[PDB]
């Protein structure tokens, strides 16, 4: 509930590491925007949402729970941000546009979450 098993700091500590990561993705705006905001299945027009990903998630909820402090363990934010590029991954059938957008997000992030997952977990 509170402290998983590893270190687990203040939701702000994490953010210190986490957010910067998200922020690298935030630079990848054309790749992050599709998530910086909720993955509107209406704006998208994909009723198949929640019927594939099961865990929608989006840099909106992400950059939020992070910022707001709805965390305690960094791997949680990771499992979410990754769960995000994931929706773009197993949802867009891979051969799509987000495919490129999520690819990077997970890339930079996997490159951002290193200084994080290391100083966070």
């Amino acid at each position: 509930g509170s402290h998983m098993r590893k270190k687990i700091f203040k939701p702000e500590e994490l953010r210190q590491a986490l957010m910067p990561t998200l922020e690298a993705l935030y630079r990848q705006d054309p790749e992050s925007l599709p998530f910086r905001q909720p993955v509107d299945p209406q704006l998208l027009g994909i009723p198949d949402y929640f019927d594939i990903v099961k865990n929608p998630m989006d840099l909106s909820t992400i950059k939020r729970k992070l910022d707001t402090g709805q965390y305690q363990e960094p791997w949680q934010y990771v499992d979410d941000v990754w769960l995000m590029f994931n929706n773009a991954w197993l949802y867009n059938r891979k051969t799509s546009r987000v495919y490129k957008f999520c690819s990077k997000l997970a890339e930079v992030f996997e490159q951002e979450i290193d200084p994080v997952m290391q100083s966070l977990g």
């Binding site: 054309p30 993955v39 998208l44 027009g45 799509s96 987000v98």
Partner: peptide
């Protein structure tokens, strides 16, 4: 092509 429409940034459009 592409543009912002329909799905995410999808919007194939061919016909």
């Amino acid at each position: 092509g592409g543009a912002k429409r329909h799905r995410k940034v999808l919007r194939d459009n061919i016909q």
